[PDB]
């Protein structure tokens, strides 16, 4: 646009959408069955509960994982404050002090690294600031890691989760082994695991039926008469008497349902003892001896046999440090061995095969156009559904692709919630870093095209795609992306429109008023750390990568992180029941945060390669910094994934 790269108009549109979303949420928060405060049922009260909520209140009402998440967000806020100061006060004047682009005062290109000549000997300032950004990111994330570790030392954990037991072991034999082979440890109790998933589900259904029964008994006794109900999907409505939907006594119906639940309960009680899960929860009297056994097993095989060794297949065990009882997924704890791995290689391999060729909405849409999918629509339908259907399709594809990557991890079974969240964070962040940042920056549309251009080796007339990175339209595109994530993205995260749709569908498809109450008290679910970390890290990566190339994205990134911190302080309390995950997802998020300074260094290395060329001083300096910061971080990942093998860690 003729204005500042479309930033004024797009910012006005996004802030208007944010205000409208705030208005809609303020209207619907308590009216839509307390959807905006759904975790509390499991003068703006919601707006003043994020500026008055202390950290001690959050530590109690949301867990220590929420505290770690909010401390990470606050550290990112401070880092972005420092980055915005440095950029806006040094790099932006330097970029504006250039004549390589048009002299229009209201021009976005003037505020980019492309405005400076190759012989200005001032791109050294940009490279030095890239190194400074890397150092600042490392320092702030190490401060956050120090904060996590002080809460990671005790953990009051003494239970060890052992898998690989034969389906013939007993508590007596397990205790006999742990006594005969390790005389210095005091075993409290061994809890063999059985396939208690259907049993738990039926127990929960029985409890819900019990609450419905007591509701319809208290109501009956207080009103002096019973209540008519119509058990059928969408049976509350259509008061006209029709066949199929009949009005039947509530007390008798709920009593029959409770009796059937009880018969299934006792049948599953009988049948659950015949399906051992080949696992055990051995809890010791001291974390010292628990860690001693953990070092004995996982740190090197097992160099201490016992009398009950062959009968237990001690060499086949996999002793872990266990997890919180409420983060263990007994529903999908029953898949082991070659399974969960055939499923992993059937889910994630299919996802990789699909995404490798259809990573972006652009390539997905262009495939449809080539295969004459949009031809029936675009035959002759007036200009409206011709210029608006393709853009409507691209937004939809964005959402759907992120969401499919997400669900391949809501699948994958993932025995523990902490294990599910860490893999989800890794998969979603890696996919987003390519769908959002790398491929659109380079002008590509899929990972197949990315690797075809790379050839896995520097060859041919390359380094032309490395100009779409620094055009004064890619920078404005990502500035507008950060603005949208700041206002539209955070407004939609506050509103939770798809969740509201599903909640309304569940409520309307409820048999009775008691059935409408069990939905309200069970709608709230644990906060999706990892799922939210990946999005936050993706936007942060965009901000940092384009913080020097275009020193205008920094204030908008600061605005985005402030608004996201507010929205997450709101959602962790009014919504999103507390989660008890292992303190490893936070470390993984800290490790994945360095990809943003790494990609900033990549951007500046690309610029140096384009202008000064290979073997130039600035280019070689940036390349050396990139190689060092990647090897240090890569060796930092091969350290964590192999730390338990070191006896020093124990």
Curated annotation (Swiss-Prot):
Membrane topology, record value: Multi-pass membrane protein
PTM annotation: N-Glycosylated.
Intracellular linker IL2: region residues: 149-336
Annotated glycosylation sites: 372
Effect caused by changing residue 98 to E: In HLD19; loss of mechanosensitive ion channel activity
GO biological process: lysosome organization; surfactant secretion
Cytoplasmic side: 148-338, 413-417, 509-528, 574-583
Residue intervals annotated with topology Extracellular: 98-121, 367-384, 455-476, 547-550, 612-616
Catalytic activity: Ca(2+)(in) = Ca(2+)(out)
Protein purpose: Mechanosensitive cation channel with low conductance and high activation threshold. In contrast to TMEM63B, does not show phospholipid scramblase activity. Acts as a regulator of lysosomal morphology by mediating lysosomal mechanosensitivity. Important for the baby's first breath and respiration throughout life. Upon lung inflation conducts cation currents in alveolar type 1 and 2 cells triggering lamellar body exocytosis and surfactant secretion into airspace. Also acts as an osmosensitive cation channel preferentially activated by hypotonic stress.
Subunit comment: Monomer.
Entry's family note: Belongs to the CSC1 (TC 1.A.17) family.
Protein name, per record: Mechanosensitive cation channel TMEM63A
Organism name: Homo sapiens (Human)
């Amino acid at each position: 646009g003729v204005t500042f790269g479309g930033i004024p108009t797009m910012l006005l549109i996004d802030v208007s959408c944010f205000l409208f979303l705030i208005l809609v949420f303020s209207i619907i928060r308590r009216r839509f069955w307390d959807y905006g405060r759904i975790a509390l049922v499991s003068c703006c009260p919601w707006l003043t509960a994020i500026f008055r909520l202390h950290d001690d209140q959050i530590l109690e009402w949301c867990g220590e994982d929420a505290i770690h998440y909010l401390s990470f967000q606050r550290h990112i806020i401070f880092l972005l404050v420092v980055v915005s100061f440095l950029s806006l006060c040094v790099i932006l004047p330097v970029n504006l002090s250039g004549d390589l682009l048009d002299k229009d005062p209201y021009s976005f290109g003037r505020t980019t690294i492309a405005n400076l000549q190759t012989d200005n000997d001032l791109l050294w300032l940009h490279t030095i600031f890239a190194v400074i950004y890397l150092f600042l990111t490392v320092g702030f994330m190490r401060h956050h890691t120090q904060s996590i570790k002080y809460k990671e030392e005790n953990l009051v954990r003494r239970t060890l989760f052992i898998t690989g037991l034969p389906r013939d072991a007993r508590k007596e034999t397990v205790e006999s082994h742990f006594r005969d082979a390790y005389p210095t440890c005091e075993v409290v109790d061994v809890q063999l695991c059985y396939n208690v998933a259907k049993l738990i589900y039926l127990c929960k259904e029985k409890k819900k039926t019990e609450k419905s029964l007591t509701y319809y008994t208290n109501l009956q006794v207080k009103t002096g008469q019973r209540t008519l109900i119509n058990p059928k999907p969408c049976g509350q409505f259509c008061c006209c008497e029709v066949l199929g939907c009949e009005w039947e006594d509530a007390i008798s119906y709920y009593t029959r349902m409770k009796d059937r639940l009880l018969e299934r309960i006792t049948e599953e009680e009988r049948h659950v003892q015949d399906q051992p899960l080949g696992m055990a929860f051995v809890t010791f009297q001291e974390k010292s001896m628990a860690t001693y056994i953990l070092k004995d097993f996982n740190a090197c095989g097992e160099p201490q046999p016992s009398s009950h060794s062959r009968e237990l297949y001690t060499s086949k065990w996999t002793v872990t440090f266990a997890a919180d009882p409420e983060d263990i997924c007994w529903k999908n704890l029953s898949i082991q061995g070659l399974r969960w791995w055939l499923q992993w290689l059937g889910i994630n391999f299919t996802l990789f095969l699909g995404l490798f060729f259809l990573t972006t909405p652009s390539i997905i849409l262009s495939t449809m156009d080539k295969f004459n999918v949009t031809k029936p629509i675009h035959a002759l339908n007036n200009p409206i559904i011709s210029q608006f259907f393709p853009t409507l399709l691209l937004w939809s594809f964005s959402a759907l692709l992120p969401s499919i990557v997400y669900y391949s991890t809501l699948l994958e079974s993932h025995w523990t919630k902490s294990g599910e969240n860490q893999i989800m964070m890794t998969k979603v962040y890696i996919f987003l870093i390519f769908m959002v940042l790398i491929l659109p920056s380079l002008g590509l549309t899929s990972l197949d095209f990315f690797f075809r251009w790379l050839f896995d080796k520097t060859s041919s007339e390359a380094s032309i795609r490395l100009e779409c990175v620094f055009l004064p339209d890619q920078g404005a595109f990502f500035v507008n992306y950060v603005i949208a994530s700041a206002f539209i993205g955070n407004g939609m995260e506050l509103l939770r429109l798809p969740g509201l749709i599903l909640y309304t569908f569940r409520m309307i498809m409820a048999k009775t008023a008691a059935d409408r109450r069990n939905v309200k008290q069970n709608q709230a679910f644990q906060y999706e750390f990892g799922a939210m970390y990946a999005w936050m890290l993706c936007v942060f990566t965009v901000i940092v990568a384009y913080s020097i190339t275009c020193p205008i994205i920094a204030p908008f990134g600061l605005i985005y992180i402030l608004l996201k911190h507010m929205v997450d302080r709101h959602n962790l309390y009014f919504v999103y029941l507390p989660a008890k995950l292992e303190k490893g997802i936070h470390f993984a998020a800290v490790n994945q945060a360095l990809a943003a300074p790494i990609l900033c260094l990549f951007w500046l290395y690309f610029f140096s390669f384009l202008r000064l060329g290979m073997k130039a001083p600035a280019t070689l300096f940036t390349f050396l910094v990139l190689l060092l910061t990647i090897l240090v971080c890569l060796a930092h990942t091969c350290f964590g994934c192999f730390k338990h093998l070191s006896p020093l860690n124990y």
